[PDB]
Design a protein around this nucleic acid. Sequence first.
RNA 1: AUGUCGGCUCAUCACAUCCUGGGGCUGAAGUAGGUCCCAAGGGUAUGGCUGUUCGCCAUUUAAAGUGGUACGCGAGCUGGGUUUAGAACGUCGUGAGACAGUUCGGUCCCUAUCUGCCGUGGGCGCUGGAGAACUGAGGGGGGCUGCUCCUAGUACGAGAGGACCGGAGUGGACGCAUCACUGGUGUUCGGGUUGUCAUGCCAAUGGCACUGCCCGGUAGCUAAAUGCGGAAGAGAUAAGUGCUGAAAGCAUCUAAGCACGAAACUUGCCCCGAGAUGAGUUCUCCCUGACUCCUUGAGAGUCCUGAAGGAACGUUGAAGACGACGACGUUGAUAGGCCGGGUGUGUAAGCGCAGCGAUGCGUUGAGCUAACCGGUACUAAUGAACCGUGAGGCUUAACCU
RNA 2: GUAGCGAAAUUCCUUGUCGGGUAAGUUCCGACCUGCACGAAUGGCGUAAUGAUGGCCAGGCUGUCUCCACCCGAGACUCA
RNA 3: AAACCGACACAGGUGGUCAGGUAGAGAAUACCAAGGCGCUUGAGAGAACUCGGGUGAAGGAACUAGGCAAAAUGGUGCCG
RNA 4: GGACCGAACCGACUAAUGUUGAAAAAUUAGCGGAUGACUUGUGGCUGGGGGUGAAAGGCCAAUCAAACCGGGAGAUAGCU
Lengths: 56, 209, 123, 118, 16, 114
Amino acid sequence: AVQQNKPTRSKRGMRRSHDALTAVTSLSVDKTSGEKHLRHHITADGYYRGRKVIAK
Amino acid sequence: MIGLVGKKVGMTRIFTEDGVSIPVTVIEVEANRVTQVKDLANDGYRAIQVTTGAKKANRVTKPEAGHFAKAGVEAGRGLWEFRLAEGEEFTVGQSISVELFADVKKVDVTGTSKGKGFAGTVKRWNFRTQDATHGNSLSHRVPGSIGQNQTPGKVFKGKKMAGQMGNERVTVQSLDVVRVDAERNLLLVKGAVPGATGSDLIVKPAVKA
Amino acid sequence: MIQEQTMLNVADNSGARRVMCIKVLGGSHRRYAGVGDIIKITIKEAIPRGKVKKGDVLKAVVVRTKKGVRRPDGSVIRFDGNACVLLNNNSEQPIGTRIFGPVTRELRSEKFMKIISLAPEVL
Amino acid sequence: MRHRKSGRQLNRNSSHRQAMFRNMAGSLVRHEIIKTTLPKAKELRRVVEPLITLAKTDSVANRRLAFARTRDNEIVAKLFNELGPRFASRAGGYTRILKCGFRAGDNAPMAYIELVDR
Amino acid sequence: PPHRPRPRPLPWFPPR
Amino acid sequence: SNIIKQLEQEQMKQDVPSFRPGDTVEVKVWVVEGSKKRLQAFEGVVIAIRNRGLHSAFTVRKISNGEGVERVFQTHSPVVDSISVKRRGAVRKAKLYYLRERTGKAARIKERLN
RNA sequence: AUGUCGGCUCAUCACAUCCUGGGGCUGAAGUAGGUCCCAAGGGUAUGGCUGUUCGCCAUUUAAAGUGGUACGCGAGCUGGGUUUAGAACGUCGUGAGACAGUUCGGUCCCUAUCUGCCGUGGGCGCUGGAGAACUGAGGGGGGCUGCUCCUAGUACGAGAGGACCGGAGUGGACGCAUCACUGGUGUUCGGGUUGUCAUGCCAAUGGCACUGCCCGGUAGCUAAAUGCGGAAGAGAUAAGUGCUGAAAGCAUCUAAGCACGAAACUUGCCCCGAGAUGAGUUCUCCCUGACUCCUUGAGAGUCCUGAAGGAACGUUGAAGACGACGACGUUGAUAGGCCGGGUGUGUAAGCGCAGCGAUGCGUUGAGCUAACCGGUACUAAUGAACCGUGAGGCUUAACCU
RNA sequence: GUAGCGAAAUUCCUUGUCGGGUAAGUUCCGACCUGCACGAAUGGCGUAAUGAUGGCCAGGCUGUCUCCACCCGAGACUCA
RNA sequence: AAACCGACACAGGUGGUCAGGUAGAGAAUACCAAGGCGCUUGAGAGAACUCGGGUGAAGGAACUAGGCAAAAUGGUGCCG
RNA sequence: GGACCGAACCGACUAAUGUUGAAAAAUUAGCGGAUGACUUGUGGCUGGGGGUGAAAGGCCAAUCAAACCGGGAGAUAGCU
Ligand SMILES: [K+]
Ligand SMILES: [K+]
Ligand SMILES: [K+]
Ligand SMILES: [K+]
Ligand SMILES: [K+]
Ligand SMILES: [K+]
Ligand SMILES: [K+]
Ligand SMILES: [K+]
Ligand SMILES: [K+]
Ligand SMILES: [K+]
Ligand SMILES: [K+]
Ligand SMILES: [K+]
Ligand SMILES: [K+]
Ligand SMILES: [K+]
Ligand SMILES: [K+]
Ligand SMILES: [K+]
Ligand SMILES: [K+]
Ligand SMILES: [K+]
Ligand SMILES: [K+]
Ligand SMILES: [K+]
Ligand SMILES: [K+]
Ligand SMILES: [K+]
Ligand SMILES: [Mg+2]
Ligand SMILES: [Mg+2]
Ligand SMILES: [Mg+2]
Ligand SMILES: [Mg+2]
Ligand SMILES: [Mg+2]
Ligand SMILES: [Mg+2]
Ligand SMILES: [Mg+2]
Ligand SMILES: [Mg+2]
Ligand SMILES: [Mg+2]
Ligand SMILES: [Mg+2]
Ligand SMILES: [Mg+2]
Ligand SMILES: [Mg+2]
Ligand SMILES: [Mg+2]
Ligand SMILES: [Mg+2]
Ligand SMILES: [Mg+2]
Ligand SMILES: [Mg+2]
Ligand SMILES: [Mg+2]
Ligand SMILES: [Mg+2]
Ligand SMILES: [Mg+2]
Ligand SMILES: [Mg+2]
Ligand SMILES: [Mg+2]
Ligand SMILES: [Mg+2]
Ligand SMILES: [Mg+2]
Ligand SMILES: [Mg+2]
Ligand SMILES: [Mg+2]
Ligand SMILES: [Mg+2]
Ligand SMILES: [Mg+2]
Ligand SMILES: [Mg+2]
Ligand SMILES: [Mg+2]
Ligand SMILES: [Mg+2]
Ligand SMILES: [Mg+2]
Ligand SMILES: [Mg+2]
Ligand SMILES: [Mg+2]
Ligand SMILES: [Mg+2]
Ligand SMILES: [Mg+2]
Ligand SMILES: [Mg+2]
Ligand SMILES: [Mg+2]
Ligand SMILES: [Mg+2]
Ligand SMILES: [Mg+2]
Ligand SMILES: [Mg+2]
Ligand SMILES: [Mg+2]
Ligand SMILES: [Mg+2]
Ligand SMILES: [Mg+2]
Ligand SMILES: [Mg+2]
Ligand SMILES: [Mg+2]
Ligand SMILES: [Mg+2]
Ligand SMILES: [Mg+2]
Ligand SMILES: [Mg+2]
Ligand SMILES: [Mg+2]
Ligand SMILES: [Mg+2]
Ligand SMILES: [Mg+2]
Ligand SMILES: [Mg+2]
Ligand SMILES: [Mg+2]
Ligand SMILES: [Mg+2]
Ligand SMILES: [Mg+2]
Ligand SMILES: [Mg+2]
Ligand SMILES: [Mg+2]
Ligand SMILES: [Mg+2]
Ligand SMILES: [Mg+2]
Ligand SMILES: [Mg+2]
């Protein structure tokens, strides 16, 4: 099964009207390190909810 | 006649002395509290709104809390309306118990059926399967033809096809009331009713009778 | 749970040994016959000098099934085999004079009281 | 439908799943902290925590059960000599899962799972 | 009667 | 679960004797031939037990008038008047369905001597 | 290049009606028919033979309707028949070959753009915002029927036989729900066992051999399991039956007027449903700053403010393709663990005793036990932050000042 | 047109007729002869054994089916 | 065989030699040795439907053009 | 022993899959032959109205009722 007519650039754009990404609503700030992090995830320096939880 | 809101507790059996096992659904019917009364003057129809159960105060939004506050009833887990027959009367704040069903022989029970998700035509519509063997190519449970030819050159509305099954409102009519235990807040009805254990049920006196 | 093509033993002394159900009577598209139901049968195996002959087409009542019968308290009675009693095609009365093996109380009716009375055991 | 069913399949057959969690449970007991995917970490809790529970009550039978479920004498010896005692007065919850980013290769959500007294 | 032969295959040709 | 537990408990018989698969039991059941109630005995080997509170059942097999018969009894049914163990059988398995394909000497169960 | 018979799957309409419903006439006593009128709501066999459609036959059924839909339906299946290439028979032909014929064999492609259809979301709208509960325009589903008993061996009839009307019971087929029971499944639970490899060895275990092969089986899902349904009633009618009644001193169901009258129609039952843009109703909740400029208006901008609520995130669910929907987030049982129970399996391991040994016995209904039940903050569900604003146009009426 | 064979890999009429098998058999087996249009090395008729050969019947067996249910994997679906 | 023949780092093809252990008649087959590898997208999810499998109450060819497919049988010794 | 059962090896009867394939003929499960009119390596010979053919108009480099390449050649085309 295949198109009988070439779809327009208009229709292409309409289909892609739902393809947009969502930015991360809000990042959190660790209360000790001050680093930004995804909520409920550890920071890059291994902090979570103030506590140093992992090395590196 | 008004109904009550209850909760499907589960199924069991009642043995009778004459040696019959009656399959029963156990419906827990706590006090239904009237939250609002609707009348012709203001609303254009007669009905009561009832709540039942409980709700943690922090889960009750301010709009909901204000509604319960006006009635002067504790917040329940939801609101349900029942249309009033011409004879009936109720007041805001009033409790209605399962004693309501004391003399009722048959009830209708409305619930949300269990959710089967996306179901095929075999399960959803009892379509017959095609041959398992004798050369069938990739078409064992598929629906077969879905229309005619150039006339009408379309598929008719309401064609039975795969789709969401269950997780919808279902009423089972004319179930026998086996027992009404006011003290335990229990209604026993004979037979199965819609929904999973724990689900809300609406119980009304049977319309057919 | 007897259907067309099901082979049954015979629980009587009609002379038949094996019979085959060729029709479940009593409704359009009726699928199954259980204990107490009338079926149309053909005789597949018969004793030399019996009241019935191989190839005869008559009726029978199912008296024992492997699927069994449920009772009002939820109990079940299952038998090791399927068995029927041959009936006259018109009168629907037993052909044999003796019943072999147990039968159930599902037969307790004006129609099959002769079978009940002749049966060595009723469950 | 999977109403009320427990257990993740994790795109493996049963024998592979069992082998993997046996290995992973060994890793966690040895290292006390490992990085894995978040669903694997969530499933691992259901394997390791019963092992630690078993190790609280030291007996020949329990050591043999643990061996049957780990197939590593070093792991059994550590369960019964170190971890059992360490968790003697803890009613479950021997592990914690800490979510930590996405894997470069395949964007899998990753987590650390560690013993809580590490 | 039939108005068409039962479908058949074509011989391979260098495609591009 | 307390609600259904309570409903179930109030219907349960308190006088159910202990029995195991492989036991020979006699079950007395009420039979109603019109007005007259009477007890009919069913004696056989217990080949299966379903323990499930009020929903407990047991299956008894016998050979009757040339015919194998199984009856599944609902243990707490009022239809069942009484149960009595006539002989204690020695078997390994919970369910003795393998007896269905056995007859005579082969279907014999050793007695549980204690 | 518009794929062709039949089958399968899935249908949908007509009515010239097969059944069921209503009725007139009968060469209609009754029962049972004949015939014609009205009626399309629902229903409307399984097999043997054959490629068959058909047909014949067997046995059912209330009935096994007739047609239209590309002789409905191959981008849905089949490929038996029939239009390829092989081969043979009869026949025709000197022959190549051929057939008012026959016979054996013989590749069925397509990831769906658009319409359509089944489901399920996102956007914006609905005139301040928000959370709920509704009304119900409108739409869809459903609508089958047997047998027995009572009425009554009554009415009818010389007998034989044998009712209407009305009532009760129990079935078949179909549909909906459900898992208490009976069962299936149950590669996540327990056990038995063959071969082999390993854990130093013994003992005990694990891997692999379709889950190695098996026996049981929890929860869930489920049918063969077991609950429930089709209606009554009402309105307006069909054919039909009438009442009163002239035109036409009579007669006349009809012209005026009035009454009955069917599974059809409109309701009544079930479900969807306010994008019903004709965007409805009810209840509740929230927001009561300052200033500047301009082409002066439903204008723009700055600062302050950020509510109700929402969303995100996290723990998740008998909710689920994803979205969505539901629960819960420490003021906490949302999930996992843990504790207790239940259930399943069937008396673990170790030790002791007996036996030459295989093994048995005792400790012991032992040990282990998934998805179940009841508890329990041990682990994970964060302080925040994000979106959403700051009293809501004009006109006209009425009522208040 | 002999022997032999014959509704046949051949028989149009034709599902011929009779018998057997099935509850029911346009196929099958045994016959009949009315051979449309068999027939003697483009061999006739038989034939043990053999056949991934054609037709038919029976036992066993079964999800082929009545009528499907559940489960395990690989895809489908979501993310990179 | 990713280096040869197959347009490809392609389920294909490619002559000769070597051949351990336990079970086994065996170079079959299962599990292993020496030795060699996990197949150059992954992660989740646990719908329909498709593919490849497992089990199935009662019935047992009723399926179908046709038992197609599946299920079944399956070894050795002795008797027969 | 053109004997039997059965691997290697040689074949290719059935089914499913695949059909913009993993593959311009395969994969999976079954299947036939398997001391012979067997199978296979290396090299050689037969040439296009010619070869070769246990005969299918089969095969002669994925091409066959007359190979492929170049030429006559811009054949001819009352046809599109
Ligand atoms: K039609
Ligand atoms: K109709
Ligand atoms: K056509
Ligand atoms: K088409
Ligand atoms: K297709
Ligand atoms: K279009
Ligand atoms: K169940
Ligand atoms: K179950
Ligand atoms: K082993
Ligand atoms: K609205
Ligand atoms: K918990
Ligand atoms: K136990
Ligand atoms: K002839
Ligand atoms: K001829
Ligand atoms: K010749
Ligand atoms: K000869
Ligand atoms: K052959
Ligand atoms: K290489
Ligand atoms: K998914
Ligand atoms: K050569
Ligand atoms: K040539
Ligand atoms: K060439
Ligand atoms: Mg076009
Ligand atoms: Mg997109
Ligand atoms: Mg669901
Ligand atoms: Mg079918
Ligand atoms: Mg194909
Ligand atoms: Mg298939
Ligand atoms: Mg049109
Ligand atoms: Mg759960
Ligand atoms: Mg994957
Ligand atoms: Mg394995
Ligand atoms: Mg008409
Ligand atoms: Mg109607
Ligand atoms: Mg057509
Ligand atoms: Mg196709
Ligand atoms: Mg088509
Ligand atoms: Mg030819
Ligand atoms: Mg309607
Ligand atoms: Mg409708
Ligand atoms: Mg249950
Ligand atoms: Mg079971
Ligand atoms: Mg099992
Ligand atoms: Mg060793
Ligand atoms: Mg050992
Ligand atoms: Mg190994
Ligand atoms: Mg191996
Ligand atoms: Mg009706
Ligand atoms: Mg127990
Ligand atoms: Mg053990
Ligand atoms: Mg004939
Ligand atoms: Mg004949
Ligand atoms: Mg037959
Ligand atoms: Mg013949
Ligand atoms: Mg000849
Ligand atoms: Mg001659
Ligand atoms: Mg000659
Ligand atoms: Mg010859
Ligand atoms: Mg992608
Ligand atoms: Mg590669
Ligand atoms: Mg290769
Ligand atoms: Mg080779
Ligand atoms: Mg090998
Ligand atoms: Mg090695
Ligand atoms: Mg799957
Ligand atoms: Mg199987
Ligand atoms: Mg079965
Ligand atoms: Mg069975
Ligand atoms: Mg059988
Ligand atoms: Mg048939
Ligand atoms: Mg058929
Ligand atoms: Mg086969
Ligand atoms: Mg097989
Ligand atoms: Mg040979
Ligand atoms: Mg060849
Ligand atoms: Mg092969
Ligand atoms: Mg061989
Ligand atoms: Mg030729
Ligand atoms: Mg070639
Ligand atoms: Mg030429
Ligand atoms: Mg020239
Ligand atoms: Mg030219």
